[PDB]
Amino acid sequence: MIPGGLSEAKPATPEIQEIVDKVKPQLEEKTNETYGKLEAVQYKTQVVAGTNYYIKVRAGDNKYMHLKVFKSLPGQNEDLVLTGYQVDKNKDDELTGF
């Protein structure tokens, strides 16, 4: 109910909405490992000047995390990168924000 910001806990998507697993070429920068197609569980969204999604993932020791994978406008068309990674989390740590 507040302008362009913190949403509510969103459950999950249908069979198609595959922003969850675009991690394979975009963790390569700093979160690179054998961690490919990381296991996301719950989702959320945000709005600024385009689309700003959120994904809660699992990675490593089945250790969970959050992902600021932010989409945007269609200058070309589709684009999204993790504008922040944090891998010290759990399922309880969900998708707080910021």
Partner 1 sequence: QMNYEEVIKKYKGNENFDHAAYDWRLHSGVTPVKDQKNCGSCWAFSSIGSVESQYAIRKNKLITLSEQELVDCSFKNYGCNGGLINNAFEDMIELGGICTDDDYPYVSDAPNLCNIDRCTEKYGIKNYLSVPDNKLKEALRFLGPISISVAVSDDFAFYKEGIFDGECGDQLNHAVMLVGFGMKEIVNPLTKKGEKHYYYIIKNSWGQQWGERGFINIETDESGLMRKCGLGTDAFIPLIE
Task: State the residues that interact with partner 1 by CB under 8 A.
Answer: 1-7, 46-50, 52, 70, 72-73, 83, 97-98
Is 29 or 33 the residue whose CB approaches partner 1 more closely? 29
CA distance 39 to 3: 30
CA distance 65 to 71: 19
Is 53 or 58 the residue whose CB approaches partner 1 more closely? 53
91 sits near Na ion (criterion: CB under 5 A): yes
Q: Hey, which residues between 60 and 89 contact Na ion (CB under 5 A)? A: 61
18 sits near Na ion (criterion: CB under 5 A): no
Question: Minimal distance in Å, beta carbon 1 to partner 1?
Answer: 6
CA distance 8 to 22: 23
CA distance 14 to 85: 25
CA distance 92 to 30: 24
Is 39 or 42 the residue whose CB approaches partner 1 more closely? 42
